[PDB]
TrEMBL record, chains A, C:
Binding residues for Ca(2+) 5: E26
Annotated protein name in UniProt: Uncharacterized protein
Disulphide-bridged cysteine pairs: C50-C52
From-to range in the entire protein, with total length: 322 to 402 of 642
Domain of life where this protein originates: Bacteria
Residues the entry annotates as binding Ca(2+) 4: E26
Binding site for Ca(2+) 3: E26
From TrEMBL, chain B:
Domain of life, source organism: Bacteria
Species of the source: Desulfofustis sp. PB-SRB1
Portion held of the full protein: 162 to 241 of 642
Record's protein name: Uncharacterized protein
Length: 81, 80, 81
């Protein structure tokens, strides 16, 4: 591999319930779940410095975590939110 | 599985303080890289790039190079 | 030029959808896109100090960016917001 390759991301989405449709303002609301997964060696760590196999971040967006750890992460958004 | 990463290696000769892991360099060298006696295979990639009016500057990153390796590059315009 | 000059700004706006009109309170709501462009040599930088060709700021208003970088920028507002 001379030069570089883009990081591959797996995505999935599920719809649980349609909770409303607005026919005059032309919008609808939905409840569901989103999941992302990717592989990046720059995020790897050595267990002996923490004694753990899983490192976790909670109640934060991808942009916030990327800013805190100073590494590029695949942030996303809803286009018509 | 195997593992990947960077490492630091400290070698000593008749220097018992090395096993503490804090040996500072001293004396005259005694060991050298073995690969500097040989050479490996080749990797080639070709890409087409365009410089727009507002995109006249472009940069690309390369993978890590081991000691002793060589790098070559060339650019040829499509037309005039 | 002996005298100082004003910086020239290019502006554009598009309307996507009219989403509501209130006939008693006399107001309306709209969805669209806005774009600004200008040229300032004081914002220029040298690529060899960052290895990048584009420097970006995200999720911030023009006033916040101007306050952060300590340079005057063309902030704007909606008159009848």
């Amino acid at each position: 591999s001379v030069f570089l390759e883009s990081d591959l991301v797996t995505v999935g989405l599920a719809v649980d319930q349609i909770v409303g449709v607005d026919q005059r303002s032309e919008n609808f609301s939905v409840v569901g779940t989103l999941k992302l997964s990717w592989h990046d060696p720059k995020l790897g760590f050595s267990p002996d410095q923490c004694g753990c196999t899983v490192k976790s971040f909670e109640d934060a967006s991808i942009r916030a975590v990327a800013g805190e750890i100073n590494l590029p992460l695949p942030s996303f958004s809803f286009y018509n939110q | 599985t195997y593992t990947t990463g960077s490492f630091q290696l400290i070698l000593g000769l008749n220097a018992p303080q090395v096993i503490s892991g804090e040996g500072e360099p001293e004396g005259e060298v005694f060991a050298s890289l073995a690969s500097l006696e040989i050479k490996p295979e080749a990797h080639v990639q070709e890409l087409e790039i365009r410089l727009d009016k507002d995109t006249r500057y472009l940069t690309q990153h390369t993978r890590n190079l081991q000691p002793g390796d060589t790098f070559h590059a060339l650019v040829e315009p499509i037309g005039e």
